[PDB]
Design an enzyme around this catalytic site. Structure first.
Site, PDB file in Angstrom:
ATOM      1  N   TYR B 229       5.258  11.707  22.880  1.00 48.69           N
ATOM      2  CA  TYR B 229       6.534  12.047  23.508  1.00 48.69           C
ATOM      3  C   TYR B 229       6.958  13.495  23.258  1.00 48.69           C
ATOM      4  O   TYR B 229       7.747  14.039  24.032  1.00 48.69           O
ATOM      5  CB  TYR B 229       7.631  11.019  23.191  1.00 48.69           C
ATOM      6  CG  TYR B 229       7.519   9.835  24.117  1.00 48.69           C
ATOM      7  CD1 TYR B 229       6.887   8.659  23.708  1.00 48.69           C
ATOM      8  CD2 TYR B 229       7.978   9.914  25.432  1.00 48.69           C
ATOM      9  CE1 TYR B 229       6.745   7.587  24.574  1.00 48.69           C
ATOM     10  CE2 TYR B 229       7.844   8.845  26.306  1.00 48.69           C
ATOM     11  CZ  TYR B 229       7.226   7.687  25.870  1.00 48.69           C
ATOM     12  OH  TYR B 229       7.087   6.628  26.730  1.00 48.69           O
ATOM     13  N   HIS B 384      10.702   4.080  20.524  1.00 53.81           N
ATOM     14  CA  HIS B 384       9.248   4.209  20.688  1.00 53.81           C
ATOM     15  C   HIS B 384       8.514   4.104  19.354  1.00 53.81           C
ATOM     16  O   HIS B 384       7.282   4.037  19.313  1.00 53.81           O
ATOM     17  CB  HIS B 384       8.884   5.518  21.390  1.00 53.81           C
ATOM     18  CG  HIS B 384       9.219   5.537  22.849  1.00 53.81           C
ATOM     19  ND1 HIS B 384       8.752   4.587  23.732  1.00 53.81           N
ATOM     20  CD2 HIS B 384       9.955   6.404  23.584  1.00 53.81           C
ATOM     21  CE1 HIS B 384       9.197   4.861  24.947  1.00 53.81           C
ATOM     22  NE2 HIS B 384       9.929   5.959  24.883  1.00 53.81           N
TER      23      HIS B 384
END
Ligand SMILES: [Zn+2]
Ligand SMILES: [Zn+2]
EC number: 4.2.2.26
Lengths: 705, 705
Positions: B229, B384
């Site tokens: 990410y 996440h």
């Protein structure tokens, strides 16, 4: 001297020219650097102790390569340190060898002395005799006599007259043994050793090199043990031939049997995809065209033919033969003579006369669209043969797609049973269920009996290679009592689709109601299926009791019926869809999703998934399917297109023993495949699907509507 | 106009010089060819229908890239064709957009209008606004009015004021949203849109771009959600910053927080091995440095720094940013300015102030085949994040060796749940048992509760990087009630061995008798074990009932005792040996060999093996191990050496909370690792290892005897 794999003239050419061709100089310098490093360790010749891949095994291997390489480098450079090292290695062998008996870590193979089996002894001799041939003129007479009497003559005697069970074998063991002994014969000027190598121990030609050339190759240059063993036997074939040529050109060995040796080399190349040999029969999957046997063989054939398409293969090998022949390859590449190799569709006859079935290779497309379909309609191939009549493999996009397991063996890993064929090679790898072909009643073809399998071969019914489509068709009437099956496999060019498609039609008829299994071993990750799987209830049980089934876990079963079904998977950047339907009076139809690893306490088997189509209590079945590459997955740029199959359904009808397959496409077009099984190219045929009438001429027809 | 990601001066520079630099020309021609091909399909703007990876999803994606690329090409080449295509696409969007409500194929995410979620809507805007910026010149007043009032202003309002749950978010969704709206603000000359993007909806700076810059990165430029990410958010970070710089250079955005944006780009590169990002937390394993976010970011940072080591990475990316900044990169590469990138060991703090745990990267060896150990001692990383405190990964020889699963997700594959995170991402991928770290009582860290996990971070105890050895040590006191564990991981240079070795010491203390599991997820094929496995009796049962255990099959259990044991596997040309021993009062010690795929009816999970060390009914344990790369397997030349582990045994003793590990080597030497857990450099320590006394100073010591 030298006068064997290299000649005096070769050495002169290399000495004069090797620095002028970058590819050759890089290869030479790497070999030289590696040998210099090895030499710093001194002369290390251990008492034989270890099995395959063990220290003494691999050390004696490093030594035979060192002897050959030192001899070569002595000749090319004139540097005496290379003569000294090769000489001192050989003198150490000469001192040790007369005292050696049977290797202490033998198995079921004929034992060696230096090695656990006599095969590696022969390889040692093939290499070491070259090094000796290259240093002999620089030795004292006493040194020659010691080396010859101490190691070469006793080893040559051991591998020939003392080993009739090997020397007279028509098998790759026989090829290596006659090459080792014959090459020794030439180097030592021993007529007897040459004659027995060429014509067998009794000199009648019932065994020996010439008989091997007559029997082990078909007229197409296909070697009956399969691609993996073809490349292996190719070394003693091409190197003994080279020695015969340099010493006795009057024998015209490279002309023999309509240039059989030249054809063997091309055929070895033709048995690869993206540089890797098709892993049918006993085979290891990491074996490719850069293997030294093909590097040396290609150089010899280039030197003979001047075929510039071989230079393409040479560059792809990334390795060059350090011989006079290799120099010619390097020179030609440097002069920009390289032409693309003509990869083509071929029918390779099996058996000495080419009539004992055949191996079909069907190719379509170029680059990453290059598809290769392999149809294994071959005879048994002796002991390394698998029980997989009418098996197939598919390659696409530089990948194996529909796969063959190869062998259960870990090359030169001593902790894996001395690198030898594992128990699971017989119990899993050879068995029919381990392959993409018909299994009847959970029994292997010929009931897994090699004696019976050796007596039979598939009957090729048709071969076709056009721009419209490709086809092989073969019949197996002897695999089981009261069963006959026929398989027709097609590679079809559909102009509206981005990639060719496979069409498969496998018909079986049996005298008694039976279970018919058809596996598909795929490479990739399942995306989805058209069918619903039954809950496995958090357990995976062994699939069956025997014949390879004891090695499979059943992960899911799913019922299927009259309508075609679909499995779609992904591999790298491409999707693959398997559309399948089975026409049969039996309503007992299931898909079985299975995984490899049952009865494998030693973790010898890889992870592997399979989709098995099962029909139960049937006397007749037509297994029809389509294999379709499609779409693009780009994980870097993060895009996807064409991810869904373009095949809406597959339908099949049989009338009067003739087949019609209709593949309905999502754009509204369809592909009609018709099969009459009649070789008469002018015979007209008619089949009624429903009210729809299909008419064509000949064995097969493919029409895109 | 344009004055955003490229300027008017950039356009002039590109037009004048793009043909001169091969790297830029190759990229531009490839982009031009692809776009010209796309334009031949006409202007295709479908109504929103499909989920991620579906037709409308990927079509609207092709469109936003076409808008940007046509705009750029119109600027550089001048062709009316590119202007008209971008304009016609935008006009079609302008006519459709006011009519759109929530996407019909939405899931749990904030819905988009064009897309199933609002995230992709933001990406569409980031790209499309650049195209519009670049075609402003050739547009009529009514056309600009139609475009701005029809799509850009409604979309900007939708993603900001109408979506506070996303626009106020301190998360990658927030970054994409503020970049999209902020870039639109600059292009449209709307001060309000710029202000709310920089300072949040309420303009106080509680949320928005500036807050994200201050909170989401540590001072080291490590992005808290993880490498995967990090690279994703890097685009909106670096591109909004680029826009800010070209429009308001007085803001000095690239100087903000000690050049945080510059550090973010370097850290992104530092978070890869062999070009692939460490797949910790939610992550896909095929994501690498050629990802466009890093291509564009690298170009920006090179233009600012002139750091020629970045050109090494640029070449490895194999693509170039088609911007003025990318032109500078191409020019420098063409001029031979490339210098090698300095990959190095790093301690990356987590949290805004870098005091909320840390990610350690330990590198040893030279080339792109060196060893990299990752110690995951980081905070949660929000949604996440994985429940894997003190997890580790090992890389060697260009390969992943000891692995992290990443996420259960198939990027833009619609048949896999619209390309979205699968049910198994939560039930398998995030769970502790899926990782190489301690699992207590078959429950995940923080009992799998993200709220709890978000409140805690591991305590980093030591970091050392030297030529002798490397070390990380961290403590996790909050993962379970009444449990504390500590992990110290070392990379040790042992001169007599060919490769560095990993030494792992994981200590656990629990208030109540517990089950302790330590998995090792490995890449490769098992060669052998030093221990005997129990017969699995031809069945594989689900390993456990909950928390990821329901996805594993038990293939074998094997009891172990006081003495160290070993597992050896092969991957490519190298062997790896895992020598392990556990000091614990409990006698209940077993190795569980498990395989992934239970409770996976949709075939969403990959095949994967694991070796789990289990201790039952224990309050204390020290899990000690060595990971040793060794030997060579050459399948091409058919040689092997050093195939056996050089580790004879591993022994461990603890005395007053201090650990000594002795690694006995087969040549008679040994390696002694000592750990005091005392940060005082000068403090002396003593431990009695049986009849031996071990004495050292400091937190740690490693001595080769
Ligand atoms: Zn096989
Ligand atoms: Zn993870």
């Amino acid at each position: 001297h030298p006068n064997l794999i290299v000649t005096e003239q070769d050495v002169a050419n290399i000495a004069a020219s090797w620095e002028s061709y970058d590819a050759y100089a890089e290869q030479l310098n790497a070999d030289k650097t590696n040998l210099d490093a090895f030499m710093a360790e001194g002369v290390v010749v251990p008492m034989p102790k270890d099995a395959g891949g063990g220290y003494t095994h691999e050390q004696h291997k490093r030594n035979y390569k060192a002897i050959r390489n030192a001899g070569f480098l002595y000749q090319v450079t004139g540097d005496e340190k290379y003569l000294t090292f090769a000489k001192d290695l050989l003198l150490a062998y000469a001192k040790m060898y007369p005292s050696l008996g049977e290797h202490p870590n033998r198995k079921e193979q004929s034992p060696g002395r230096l090695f656990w089996q006599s095969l590696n002894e022969a390889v040692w001799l093939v290499y070491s005799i070259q090094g000796y041939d290259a240093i002999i003129d620089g030795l004292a007479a006493e040194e020659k006599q010691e080396i010859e009497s101490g190691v070469f003559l006793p080893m040559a005697k051991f591998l020939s007259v003392e080993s009739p069970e090997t020397f007279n074998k028509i098998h790759n063991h026989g090829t290596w043994a006659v090459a080792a002994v014959g090459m020794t014969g030439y180097v030592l000027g021993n007529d007897e050793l040459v004659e027995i190598s060429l014509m067998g121990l009794d000199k009648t030609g019932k065994a020996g090199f010439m008989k091997q050339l007559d029997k082990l190759f078909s007229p197409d240059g296909y070697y009956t043990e399969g691609p993996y063993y073809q490349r292996y036997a190719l070394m003693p074939f091409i190197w003994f031939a080279k020695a015969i040529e340099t010493n006795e050109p009057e024998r015209k060995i490279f002309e023999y049997r309509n240039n059989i040796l030249l054809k063997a080399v091309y055929t070895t190349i033709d048995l690869s995809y993206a540089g890797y040999f098709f892993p049918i029969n006993d085979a290891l999957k990491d074996k490719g065209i850069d293997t030294v046997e093909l590097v040396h063989a290609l150089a010899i054939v280039y030197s003979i033919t001047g075929d510039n398409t071989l230079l393409d293969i040479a560059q792809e090998q990334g390795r060059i033969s350090l011989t006079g022949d290799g120099l010619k390859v390097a020179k030609a590449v440097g002069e920009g003579l390289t032409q693309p190799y003509n990869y083509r569709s071929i029918l390779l006859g099996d058996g000495a006369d080419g009539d004992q079935g055949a191996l079909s290779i069907h190719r379509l497309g170029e680059g990453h669209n290059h598809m290769a379909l392999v149809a294994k309609n071959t005879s048994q191939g002796m002991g390394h043969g698998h029980f997989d009549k009418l098996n197939w493999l598919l390659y696409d996009n530089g990948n194996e797609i529909v796969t063959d397991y190869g062998a259960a063996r870990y090359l030169n890993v001593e902790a894996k049973y001395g690198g030898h064929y594992l128990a699971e090679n017989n119990t899993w790898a050879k068995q029919t269920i381990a392959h993409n072909t018909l299994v009847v009643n959970e029994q292997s073809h010929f009931y897994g009996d090699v004696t019976t399998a050796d007596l039979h071969h598939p009957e090729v019914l048709s071969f076709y290679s056009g721009e419209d489509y490709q086809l092989s068709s073969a019949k197996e009437a002897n695999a089981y009592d009261g069963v006959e099956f026929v398989r027709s496999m097609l590679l079809v060019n559909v102009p509206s689709l981005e990639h060719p498609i496979v069409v498969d039609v496998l018909n079986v008829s049996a005298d008694k109601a039976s279970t018919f299994d058809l596996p598909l071993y795929f490479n990739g990750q399942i995306i989805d299926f058209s069918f619903k799987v039954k809950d496995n209830k958090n357990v995976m049980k062994m699939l069956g009791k025997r014949n390879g089934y004891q090695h499979l876990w059943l992960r899911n079963t799913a019922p299927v019926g009259d309508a075609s079904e679909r499995a779609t998977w992904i591999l790298d950047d491409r999707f693959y869809s398997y559309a399948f339907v089975t026409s049969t009076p039996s309503k007992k139809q299931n898909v079985l999703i299975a995984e490899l690893g049952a009865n494998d306490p030693n973790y010898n088997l890889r992870q592997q998934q399979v989709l098995i189509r099962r029909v139960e209590k049937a006397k007749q079945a037509s297994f029809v399917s389509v294999l379709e590459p499609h779409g693009k997955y780009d994980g870097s740029l993060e895009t996807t297109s064409g991810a869904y199959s373009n095949v809406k359904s597959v339908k099949h009808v049989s009338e009067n023993g003739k087949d019609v397959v209709v593949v309905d496409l999502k754009d509204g077009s369809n592909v009609v495949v018709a099969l009459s099984y009649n070789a008469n190219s002018e015979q007209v045929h008619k089949v009624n699907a429903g009210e729809e009438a299909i008419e064509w001429k000949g064995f097969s027809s493919v029409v895109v509507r």
